[PDB]
Every structure is written in structure tokens, then in C-alpha cells.
Amino acid sequence: TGDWRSATSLYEFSAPDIDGKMVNLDKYRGHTVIVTNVASQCGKTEVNYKQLVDLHERYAEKGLRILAFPCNQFGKQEPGSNEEIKEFMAQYNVKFDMFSKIDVNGDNAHPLWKWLREQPNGKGVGGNAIKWNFTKFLIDKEGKVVKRYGPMEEPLSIEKDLPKYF
């Protein structure tokens, strides 16, 4: 319907986790959140998964949550099923929150990702499309997008921004 456009925070959305269960994202109320689109066959798959796991291990106890959305729109680098994707992330000891595969660009993009890219701090410079695998959005404890990091920005580079939003 498009009726997601009236939302003004992360907490108005729901999305299915990687086991297929619908997660109401208002569960993240009051937490600091990173949302990222992931892929298993990307040149930066390893550095992003290793460093997202490191961020989660070190900062979950400070209220950080990480929401990972698989996406096959970037070089068909997430071709596997949700069950295969779940198995893949086990080699990295992923313990943050894993979601079912989605599109992030175009008319079929999941409404959460359409919304993320329309935010004042989520929309980028000359257009808001997701450029490639492992874009990250940093979301504050009120559910607002505060920063967007591109595919080349390694997760450890979010660390310098993260604690101030605690």
C-alpha cells in the first residue's frame, strides 16, 4: 500500500527473522541499533561479519543491537536460501539478530529499507539507493536514523560514533 511512509521511527516496523517469524521492531526501543544489509559471497563479507560480531560481543551489554538483512541485489552475492544463510553466519559465531532475505532497493524493497533511505540522516547525497552489500545505518535509542555508512566503511569505523549515542 505504501502506508509505511507515515512512520517516524524504526519502532513502527516489523520484519520476519531468518527463521520466518515476524519480529516487531519496537522490541528495540531504547537500544542503540545498527541495521545492515548482508551477503555471503562479497569481497567484504569476511571483514564485515568479523567486525560486526566484535562490535556485538563488546557492546551488547551497553545496549547495542545489530539487525542483519540478507540481500541478493548486489552481484547476486546472497543466492542461498534463508536456511543456508543462517548456516553460513554460524562460521562467524553470529549472535546478533538475523533476518529473512529481502530486497533493499526498488519498488519491492522491504518497507523498513524504503524508510531508512528517506531519513534526513539516511538518504545519502545524490540519491539514496543502497549502493552495494554491507551498507550500515546507525539508529539512536529513539529509533531515529543518525548516520549512514557505505559498503566500504568497515564496521569498526562505526565504533567511534557508537558510544556517544549510548
Judge whether 98 and 68 are in contact, CB under 8 Å.
Answer: yes
- Minimal CA–CA distance to 101: which of 115, 116, 86? 86
| Gap between the Cα atoms of 81 and 119, Å rounded | 30
Containing structural domain, residue 79:
3-165
| Gap between the Cα atoms of 16 and 98, Å rounded | 9
Amino acid identity at 3: D
Resolution (A): 1.5
Beta-strand relationship, 32-38 and 97-98 = unpaired
Q: Find residue 70's DSSP bridge partners.
A: 38
Judge whether 8 and 84 are in contact, CB under 8 Å.
Answer: no
DSSP characters over 30-95:
TSEEEEEEE-SSSTTHHHHHHHHHHHHHHHGGGTEEEEEEE--TTTT---S-HHHHHHHHHTTT--
Judge whether 103 and 64 are in contact, CB under 8 Å.
Answer: no
State the total domains in the chain: 1
Residue 30: CATH number of its domain: 3.40.30.10
Determined by X-ray
